[PDB]
Amino acid sequence: TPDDLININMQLQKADSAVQEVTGLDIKGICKALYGTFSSSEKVGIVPVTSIGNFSASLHAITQYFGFDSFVTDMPDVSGYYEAVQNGAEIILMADDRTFLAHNLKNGKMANNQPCTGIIYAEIASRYLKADSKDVLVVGLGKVGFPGAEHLVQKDFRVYGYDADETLLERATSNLGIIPFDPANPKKFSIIFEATPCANTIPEAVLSENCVLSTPGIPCAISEELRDKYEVQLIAEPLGIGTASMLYSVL
Ligand SMILES: NC(=O)c1ccc[n+]([C@@H]2O[C@H](COP(=O)([O-])OP(=O)(O)OC[C@H]3O[C@@H](n4cnc5c(N)ncnc54)[C@H](O)[C@@H]3O)[C@@H](O)[C@H]2O)c1
Numbered sequence: 671t672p673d674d675l676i677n678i679n680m681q682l683q684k685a686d687s688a689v690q691e692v693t694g695l696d697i698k699g700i701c702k703a704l705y706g707t708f709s710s711s712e713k714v715g716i717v718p719v720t721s722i723g724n725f726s727a728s729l730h731a732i733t734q735y736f737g738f739d740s741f742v743t744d745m746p747d748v749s750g751y752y753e754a755v756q757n758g759a760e761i762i763l764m765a766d767d768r769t770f771l772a773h774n775l776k777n778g779k780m781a782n783n784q785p786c787t788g789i790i791y792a793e794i795a796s797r798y799l800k801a802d803s804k805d806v807l808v809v810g811l812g813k814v815g816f817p818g819a820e821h822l823v824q825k826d827f828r829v830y831g832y833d834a835d836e837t838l839l840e841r842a843t844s845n846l847g848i849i850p851f852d853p854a855n856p857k858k859f860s861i862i863f864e865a866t867p868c869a870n871t872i873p874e875a876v877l878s879e880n881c882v883l884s885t886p887g888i889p890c891a892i893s894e895e896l897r898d899k900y901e902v903q904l905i906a907e908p909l910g911i912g913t914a915s916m917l918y919s920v921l
């Protein structure tokens with residue numbers, strides 16, 4: 671649909687501009703430096719899977735935006751997979767309800783959407799040009815958040831973490847060595863990474879003016895009144911940034 675095609679394109683463009691503002695680099699630039707990898711307009715076959723293919727249609731527009739030679743197969747599932755390989759797909763892109771993967775058939779590399787999304791959003795946060803300290807707050811330590819937190823620890827940031835699930839908070843503290851954040855004793859941050867399927871997860875007392883909030887979480891961690899009040903630099907996009915991360919990770 672022509673209306674929806676203008677919509678994702680604009681949404682990706684707006685997300686690109688926001689990343690440029692924060693880091694001085696576009697999404698492509700972030701990916702290339704993150705993975706040390708470059709694209710040659712690889713052929714990517716998107717196969718719809720039963721688990722109406724509007725998702726695969728979004729993926730086509732997203733991959734076209736990033737310059738990939740992408741196509742959606744006529745058939746779904748196993749028949750679609752067969753079709754994709756036969757039509758010379760170098761990378762396979764497909765998702766069920768629990769896993770969204772990219773598989774590079776040439777080099778054997780395979781990416782999972784969840785760690786790839788966490789890593790890139792953490793990466794964008796870590797590359798904030800106007801950051802005044804090495805302190806970073808991570809809210810949400812699940813499938814997306816944990817790999818994000820791990821990436822930040824490896825990049826030598828002082829990582830503060832919180833998750834409403836005490837078991838996951840404890841396990842993140844043990845394995846990663848992050849400082850457990852106490853909502854009862856809050857401090858201000860200039861860099862925040864949220865990976866949570868909930869709203870209003872970032873307390874006001876944690877925000878400083880012009881701080882970066884890098885969040886793949888849906889819905890938004892912050893109310894639009896709070897982001898206006900603190901002039902929050904929001905990095906938030908529903909699918910494209912995570913997808914770019916997957917593709918560049920397997921090149
Ligand atoms: N934008 C994208 O491209 C993209 C890609 C993948 C996933 N996502 C989204 O990212 C979000 C996280 O995904 P996930 O797979 O990590 O989910 P998950 O369930 O594995 O992890 C979410 C974690 O957040 C915690 N949490 C919930 N409410 C909280 C609160 N108020 N304070 C602190 N912690 C809280 C939960 O305990 C949970 O451990 C989801 O909304 C998902 O839809 C977005």
Ligand SMILES: [Mg+2]
Pocket residue numbers: 787886907908909910911912913
């Ligand atoms: Mg995204």
Ligand code: NA
Pocket residue numbers: 864865866867868869871887888889890891
């Ligand atoms: Na959220």
